[PDB]
Each structure stands twice: as structure tokens, then as C-alpha cells.
Design an enzyme around this catalytic site. Structure first.
Site, PDB file in Angstrom:
ATOM      1  CD  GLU A  35      -3.110  -0.786  -0.060  1.00 22.17           C
ATOM      2  OE1 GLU A  35      -3.039   0.133  -0.525  1.00 22.17           O
ATOM      3  OE2 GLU A  35      -4.179  -1.567  -0.192  1.00 22.17           O
ATOM      4  CG  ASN A  46      -8.681   6.434  -4.812  1.00 29.01           C
ATOM      5  OD1 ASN A  46      -8.898   6.615  -3.516  1.00 29.01           O
ATOM      6  ND2 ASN A  46      -7.602   5.595  -5.080  1.00 29.01           N
ATOM      7  CG  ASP A  48     -13.924   7.671  -5.844  1.00 29.09           C
ATOM      8  OD1 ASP A  48     -12.641   8.035  -5.540  1.00 29.09           O
ATOM      9  OD2 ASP A  48     -14.283   6.667  -5.031  1.00 29.09           O
ATOM     10  CB  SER A  50     -12.047   8.941  -2.685  1.00 28.97           C
ATOM     11  OG  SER A  50     -11.546   8.013  -3.187  1.00 28.97           O
ATOM     12  CG  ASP A  52      -6.568   5.193  -1.362  1.00 25.06           C
ATOM     13  OD1 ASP A  52      -7.771   5.248  -1.137  1.00 25.06           O
ATOM     14  OD2 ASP A  52      -6.031   4.508  -2.414  1.00 25.06           O
ATOM     15  CG  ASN A  59     -11.042   5.603  -0.299  1.00 25.99           C
ATOM     16  OD1 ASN A  59     -12.248   5.917  -0.450  1.00 25.99           O
ATOM     17  ND2 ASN A  59     -10.422   6.228  -1.140  1.00 25.99           N
TER      18      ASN A  59
END
Ligand SMILES: [Br-]
Ligand SMILES: [Br-]
Ligand SMILES: [Br-]
Ligand SMILES: [Br-]
Ligand SMILES: [Br-]
Ligand SMILES: [Br-]
Ligand SMILES: [Br-]
Ligand SMILES: [Br-]
Ligand SMILES: [Br-]
Ligand SMILES: [Br-]
Ligand SMILES: [Br-]
Ligand SMILES: [Br-]
Ligand SMILES: [Br-]
Ligand SMILES: [Br-]
Ligand SMILES: [Br-]
Ligand SMILES: [Br-]
Ligand code: NA
Ligand SMILES: [Pt+2]
Ligand SMILES: [Pt+2]
Ligand SMILES: [Pt+2]
Length: 129
Positions: A35, A46, A48, A50, A52, A59
């Protein structure tokens, strides 16, 4: 902060992740490797909208507030910036809520694709635990 592998294993164990919801320490360490490469300051935007955050790339759509993810929730009740701290407490506490959500560690796509079913004990091999 960029943790060492065994340094992170020790911190994760201290904070109660070893065998949390049945997931051995090696699973958590493997997840963090893929990660964030063990970097608490890691961020990833991301498609969308959002983002992380942190060592476990938690997220903003569900888990933390960043002020810039329309329609999102903050189920961990924290600013997303808390997840970037050198102290992993906020990330661990939030990860415990996530892994209890119903899909286990499948919530982390990199865990499913790179850790699940592998020899995860390799990630804690050699460490004073
Ligand atoms: Br490593
Ligand atoms: Br190490
Ligand atoms: Br420690
Ligand atoms: Br603790
Ligand atoms: Br705790
Ligand atoms: Br716990
Ligand atoms: Br393990
Ligand atoms: Br999610
Ligand atoms: Br928001
Ligand atoms: Br917004
Ligand atoms: Br909320
Ligand atoms: Br908040
Ligand atoms: Br810590
Ligand atoms: Br904790
Ligand atoms: Br917290
Ligand atoms: Br599970
Ligand atoms: Na949010
Ligand atoms: Pt803790
Ligand atoms: Pt706990
Ligand atoms: Pt700590």
C-alpha cells in the site's frame, strides 16, 4: 516516517493487530508494504475524487474526513491527515473498523492481489517479536 519492516511489525503488534479478526501480523505488514512502502506520508488520489492516506492507504469515501470528497462519510471520526502521522495509532484504530466491516482484509485491494494466500510470515521473519 518511513518505517523499517521489523519496526513496523513491532508497532503493529503493540497496537493489537497481530491476529486481529484472525489476520496474522504478516498479513498487516504485507498490506502496508504494498500500500505505502511503509511510508506514513503516502497519499494517492482515486478516479472517484477520494484519496487514500497513510501506511495502510485508508480511503476518504467512507473512513476519514478530508473536506474534498463530496458525499463521503467519516466512519473513523478523524481527519484524514491523522493517518499521515509518524504515530500509527489513528491508522491502526481505523484499520480495525475497516477489517470488521464484512469483507475482512479484501477491503485492501493490494492485500487481495499481492498478499492473500502467500507466505506472509516472511514479512515478520527475523524480527524480535
Ligand atoms: Br521490505
Ligand atoms: Br527490518
Ligand atoms: Br515498538
Ligand atoms: Br497501544
Ligand atoms: Br489499542
Ligand atoms: Br485490539
Ligand atoms: Br504471520
Ligand atoms: Br471502502
Ligand atoms: Br468531504
Ligand atoms: Br466536498
Ligand atoms: Br460519518
Ligand atoms: Br474529524
Ligand atoms: Br507507532
Ligand atoms: Br491503536
Ligand atoms: Br484514533
Ligand atoms: Br475474515
Ligand atoms: Na470522508
Ligand atoms: Pt494502540
Ligand atoms: Pt484495539
Ligand atoms: Pt506506536
Amino acid at each position: 516516517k518511513v518505517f523499517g519492516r521489523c519496526e513496523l511489525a513491532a508497532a503493529m503488534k503493540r497496537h493489537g493487530l497481530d491476529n486481529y479478526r484472525g489476520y496474522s501480523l504478516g498479513n498487516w505488514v504485507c498490506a502496508a508494504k504494498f500500500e505505502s512502502n511503509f511510508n506514513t506520508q503516502a497519499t494517492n488520489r482515486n478516479t472517484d475524487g477520494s484519496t487514500d492516506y497513510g501506511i495502510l492507504q485508508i480511503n476518504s469515501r467512507w473512513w476519514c474526513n478530508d473536506g474534498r470528497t463530496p458525499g463521503s462519510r467519516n466512519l473513523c471520526n478523524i481527519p484524514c491527515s491523522a493517518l499521515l502521522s509518524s504515530d500509527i495509532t489513528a491508522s491502526v484504530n481505523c484499520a480495525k473498523k475497516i477489517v470488521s466491516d464484512g469483507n475482512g482484509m479484501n477491503a485492501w485491494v493490494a492485500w487481495r492481489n499481492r498478499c492473500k494466500g502467500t507466505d506472509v510470515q516472511a514479512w515478520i521473519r527475523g524480527c524480535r517479536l
